[PDB]
Scaffold this active site. Structure first.
Site, PDB file in Angstrom:
ATOM      1  N   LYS A 150       0.710  -0.885  -0.122  1.00  0.00           N
ATOM      2  CA  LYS A 150       0.199  -0.004   0.295  1.00  0.00           C
ATOM      3  C   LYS A 150       0.540   1.505   0.115  1.00  0.00           C
ATOM      4  O   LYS A 150       0.983   2.059  -0.943  1.00  0.00           O
ATOM      5  CB  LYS A 150      -1.087  -0.011   1.231  1.00  0.00           C
ATOM      6  CG  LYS A 150      -1.945  -1.149   1.332  1.00  0.00           C
ATOM      7  CD  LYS A 150      -2.960  -1.216   2.491  1.00  0.00           C
ATOM      8  CE  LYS A 150      -2.248  -1.633   3.509  1.00  0.00           C
ATOM      9  NZ  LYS A 150      -1.067  -2.056   4.033  1.00  0.00           N
ATOM     10  N   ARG A 188      -8.394   1.660   9.911  1.00  0.00           N
ATOM     11  CA  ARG A 188      -7.900   0.612  10.440  1.00  0.00           C
ATOM     12  C   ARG A 188      -9.420   0.249  10.878  1.00  0.00           C
ATOM     13  O   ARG A 188      -9.110  -0.989  11.077  1.00  0.00           O
ATOM     14  CB  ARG A 188      -6.559   0.676  10.986  1.00  0.00           C
ATOM     15  CG  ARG A 188      -5.828   1.287  10.203  1.00  0.00           C
ATOM     16  CD  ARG A 188      -5.528   0.338   8.674  1.00  0.00           C
ATOM     17  NE  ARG A 188      -3.913  -0.643   9.376  1.00  0.00           N
ATOM     18  CZ  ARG A 188      -2.761  -0.138   9.554  1.00  0.00           C
ATOM     19  NH1 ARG A 188      -2.397   0.492   9.511  1.00  0.00           N
ATOM     20  NH2 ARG A 188      -1.423  -1.437  10.046  1.00  0.00           N
ATOM     21  N   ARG A 243      11.674  -6.294   4.238  1.00  0.00           N
ATOM     22  CA  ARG A 243      11.701  -5.155   4.529  1.00  0.00           C
ATOM     23  C   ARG A 243      12.607  -4.235   5.014  1.00  0.00           C
ATOM     24  O   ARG A 243      13.069  -4.751   6.413  1.00  0.00           O
ATOM     25  CB  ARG A 243      10.455  -4.772   4.945  1.00  0.00           C
ATOM     26  CG  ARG A 243       9.788  -3.071   4.299  1.00  0.00           C
ATOM     27  CD  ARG A 243       8.337  -2.171   4.733  1.00  0.00           C
ATOM     28  NE  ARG A 243       7.912  -3.037   6.344  1.00  0.00           N
ATOM     29  CZ  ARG A 243       7.149  -2.887   6.490  1.00  0.00           C
ATOM     30  NH1 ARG A 243       6.414  -2.181   5.354  1.00  0.00           N
ATOM     31  NH2 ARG A 243       6.388  -2.900   7.794  1.00  0.00           N
ATOM     32  N   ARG A 298      12.756  -2.617  10.624  1.00  0.00           N
ATOM     33  CA  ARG A 298      11.689  -1.983  11.400  1.00  0.00           C
ATOM     34  C   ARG A 298      11.695  -3.312  12.281  1.00  0.00           C
ATOM     35  O   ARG A 298      11.288  -4.182  12.482  1.00  0.00           O
ATOM     36  CB  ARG A 298      10.399  -1.573  10.835  1.00  0.00           C
ATOM     37  CG  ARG A 298      10.483  -0.399  10.441  1.00  0.00           C
ATOM     38  CD  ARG A 298       8.811  -0.444   9.214  1.00  0.00           C
ATOM     39  NE  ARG A 298       7.141  -0.723  10.177  1.00  0.00           N
ATOM     40  CZ  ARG A 298       6.513  -0.693   9.528  1.00  0.00           C
ATOM     41  NH1 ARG A 298       6.044   0.432   7.961  1.00  0.00           N
ATOM     42  NH2 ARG A 298       5.486  -0.608  10.086  1.00  0.00           N
ATOM     43  N   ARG A 312       0.797  -8.196  14.022  1.00  0.00           N
ATOM     44  CA  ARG A 312      -0.307  -7.245  13.454  1.00  0.00           C
ATOM     45  C   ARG A 312      -1.036  -7.999  12.122  1.00  0.00           C
ATOM     46  O   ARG A 312      -2.495  -6.903  11.670  1.00  0.00           O
ATOM     47  CB  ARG A 312       0.656  -6.420  12.320  1.00  0.00           C
ATOM     48  CG  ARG A 312       2.027  -5.813  13.404  1.00  0.00           C
ATOM     49  CD  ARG A 312       3.317  -5.695  12.726  1.00  0.00           C
ATOM     50  NE  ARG A 312       2.907  -4.296  11.566  1.00  0.00           N
ATOM     51  CZ  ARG A 312       4.065  -4.490  10.033  1.00  0.00           C
ATOM     52  NH1 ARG A 312       5.018  -5.043  10.934  1.00  0.00           N
ATOM     53  NH2 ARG A 312       3.963  -4.343   9.535  1.00  0.00           N
TER      54      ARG A 312
HETATM   55  N1  LIG Z   1       4.224  -5.432  -6.103  1.00  0.00           N
HETATM   56  C1  LIG Z   1       5.699  -6.150  -5.177  1.00  0.00           C
HETATM   57  N2  LIG Z   1       6.077  -6.854  -4.740  1.00  0.00           N
HETATM   58  C2  LIG Z   1       6.870  -7.755  -3.980  1.00  0.00           C
HETATM   59  N3  LIG Z   1       7.697  -6.685  -3.164  1.00  0.00           N
HETATM   60  C3  LIG Z   1       6.629  -5.170  -3.286  1.00  0.00           C
HETATM   61  C4  LIG Z   1       5.502  -5.116  -3.886  1.00  0.00           C
HETATM   62  N4  LIG Z   1       5.173  -3.815  -3.054  1.00  0.00           N
HETATM   63  C5  LIG Z   1       5.769  -3.425  -2.473  1.00  0.00           C
HETATM   64  N5  LIG Z   1       6.902  -4.397  -2.195  1.00  0.00           N
HETATM   65  C6  LIG Z   1       8.111  -4.771  -1.700  1.00  0.00           C
HETATM   66  O1  LIG Z   1       7.317  -5.296   0.102  1.00  0.00           O
HETATM   67  C7  LIG Z   1       7.548  -4.775   1.361  1.00  0.00           C
HETATM   68  C8  LIG Z   1       6.180  -4.185   2.262  1.00  0.00           C
HETATM   69  O2  LIG Z   1       5.617  -2.704   0.903  1.00  0.00           O
HETATM   70  P1  LIG Z   1       4.656  -2.065   1.655  1.00  0.00           P
HETATM   71  O3  LIG Z   1       4.365  -1.079   0.455  1.00  0.00           O
HETATM   72  O4  LIG Z   1       6.057  -0.928   2.426  1.00  0.00           O
HETATM   73  O5  LIG Z   1       3.430  -2.117   2.048  1.00  0.00           O
HETATM   74  P2  LIG Z   1       2.022  -1.909   3.335  1.00  0.00           P
HETATM   75  O6  LIG Z   1       2.466  -0.576   2.650  1.00  0.00           O
HETATM   76  O7  LIG Z   1       1.687  -2.077   2.038  1.00  0.00           O
HETATM   77  O8  LIG Z   1       3.054  -2.310   4.500  1.00  0.00           O
HETATM   78  C9  LIG Z   1       8.167  -3.863   1.065  1.00  0.00           C
HETATM   79  O9  LIG Z   1       9.762  -4.091   1.742  1.00  0.00           O
HETATM   80  C10 LIG Z   1       8.716  -3.689   0.018  1.00  0.00           C
HETATM   81  O10 LIG Z   1       9.607  -2.887  -0.591  1.00  0.00           O
HETATM   82  N1  LIG Z   2      -4.969   4.206  11.331  1.00  0.00           N
HETATM   83  C1  LIG Z   2      -4.505   3.215  12.084  1.00  0.00           C
HETATM   84  N2  LIG Z   2      -4.961   3.021  13.151  1.00  0.00           N
HETATM   85  C2  LIG Z   2      -4.650   3.021  14.627  1.00  0.00           C
HETATM   86  N3  LIG Z   2      -2.695   2.505  14.601  1.00  0.00           N
HETATM   87  C3  LIG Z   2      -2.401   2.692  13.140  1.00  0.00           C
HETATM   88  C4  LIG Z   2      -3.016   2.786  12.126  1.00  0.00           C
HETATM   89  N4  LIG Z   2      -2.129   3.512  11.501  1.00  0.00           N
HETATM   90  C5  LIG Z   2      -0.993   2.849  11.581  1.00  0.00           C
HETATM   91  N5  LIG Z   2      -1.325   2.535  12.722  1.00  0.00           N
HETATM   92  C6  LIG Z   2      -0.283   1.745  14.000  1.00  0.00           C
HETATM   93  O1  LIG Z   2       1.350   2.049  13.247  1.00  0.00           O
HETATM   94  C7  LIG Z   2       1.826   0.721  12.725  1.00  0.00           C
HETATM   95  C8  LIG Z   2       2.456   1.276  11.771  1.00  0.00           C
HETATM   96  O2  LIG Z   2       1.508   1.285  10.864  1.00  0.00           O
HETATM   97  P1  LIG Z   2       1.526   1.029   8.798  1.00  0.00           P
HETATM   98  O3  LIG Z   2       2.712   1.343   8.123  1.00  0.00           O
HETATM   99  O4  LIG Z   2       0.303   1.319   8.080  1.00  0.00           O
HETATM  100  O5  LIG Z   2       1.312  -0.638   9.395  1.00  0.00           O
HETATM  101  C9  LIG Z   2       0.474   0.114  13.037  1.00  0.00           C
HETATM  102  O6  LIG Z   2       0.905  -1.737  13.135  1.00  0.00           O
HETATM  103  C10 LIG Z   2      -0.480   0.463  14.042  1.00  0.00           C
HETATM  104  O7  LIG Z   2       0.610   0.052  15.183  1.00  0.00           O
END
Ligand SMILES: Nc1ncnc2c1ncn2[C@@H]1O[C@H](COP(=O)(O)OP(=O)(O)O)[C@@H](O)[C@H]1O
Ligand SMILES: Nc1ncnc2c1ncn2[C@@H]1O[C@H](COP(=O)(O)O)[C@@H](O)[C@H]1O
Length: 206
Positions: A13, A85, A124, A150, A161
């Site tokens: 996302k 969320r 990641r 992270r 999560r």
């Molecule tokens: N379509 C894809 N194919 C492979 N790896 C991806 C893709 N989209 C994102 N990634 C990788 O997967 C991990 C999660 O992506 P991220 O955009 O941070 O997801 P989210 O915001 O949904 O948690 C990151 O390490 C990113 O580099």
């Molecule tokens: N809309 C939301 N509501 C509550 N907690 C959130 C929200 N967005 C992010 N978080 C917190 O931030 C962490 C990382 O968010 P994300 O990077 O979106 O996975 C999550 O696991 C939650 O602890």
């Protein structure tokens, strides 16, 4: 135009939201990024949010709703990335938008299996100086660039999560489907392919 990206952690996302914001001019609101910065800065939001985040739990709705009210832009197209969320957050968003004569235009469900998001999260990496996101396999950081993992991308926190997503966030799928604005994205595909589908669903000609 107001977009919501909805889906499990690791679905891609943030990656898609950043590209759409860069290429198509959207304001990217990532509650994750905003919270992580608050934690690093030690603000009252940050200090309170920290322990929920570390455990892989959602930060309480009241704190998040206030945050979104504070940062929602007066103008511009917006991508809400990882917000709402919970159902209470979605209800609050609808009310905030109503008062501005706006509405959520499209909700994109990033549909992808657990084993995929688990590998994406495990691999990641972040450049702490720029915030740029990499993946050890799918998008390796450049040589000579120091990156970090992270703490919430650890196996046990990932598990939590995902549990939290299924319990609290997945009910938003039906919430938005009933509104007629939900579209499903195959988030298991490579980044470019996912991006093309994102553009298609929001009515952009690419
Ligand atoms: N379509 C894809 N194919 C492979 N790896 C991806 C893709 N989209 C994102 N990634 C990788 O997967 C991990 C999660 O992506 P991220 O955009 O941070 O997801 P989210 O915001 O949904 O948690 C990151 O390490 C990113 O580099
Ligand atoms: N809309 C939301 N509501 C509550 N907690 C959130 C929200 N967005 C992010 N978080 C917190 O931030 C962490 C990382 O968010 P994300 O990077 O979106 O996975 C999550 O696991 C939650 O602890």
């Amino acid at each position: 135009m107001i977009l919501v990206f909805l889906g499990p952690p690791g679905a891609g996302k943030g990656t898609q939201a950043k590209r759409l914001a860069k290429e198509k001019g959207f304001v990217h609101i990532s509650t994750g990024d905003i919270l992580r910065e608050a934690v690093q800065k030690g603000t009252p939001l940050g200090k309170k949010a920290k322990e929920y985040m570390e455990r892989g739990e959602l930060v309480p709705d009241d704190l998040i709703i206030a945050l979104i009210e504070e940062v929602f832009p007066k103008h511009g197209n917006v991508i809400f990335d990882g917000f709402p969320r919970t159902v209470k957050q979605a209800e609050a968003l609808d009310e905030m938008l109503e008062k501005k004569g706006l509405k959520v235009d499209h909700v994109l469900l990033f549909e992808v299996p657990d084993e995929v998001v688990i590998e994406r999260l495990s691999g990641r990496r972040i450049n702490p100086e720029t915030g740029e996101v990499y993946h050890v396999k799918y998008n390796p950081p450049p040589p000579g660039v120091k990156v970090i993992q992270r703490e919430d991308d650890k196996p046990e926190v990932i598990k939590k999560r995902l549990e939290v997503y299924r319990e609290q966030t997945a009910p938003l799928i039906e919430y938005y489907k009933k509104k007629g604005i939900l579209r499903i994205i195959d988030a298991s595909k490579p980044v470019e392919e996912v991006y093309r589908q994102v553009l298609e669903v929001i009515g952009d000609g690419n």
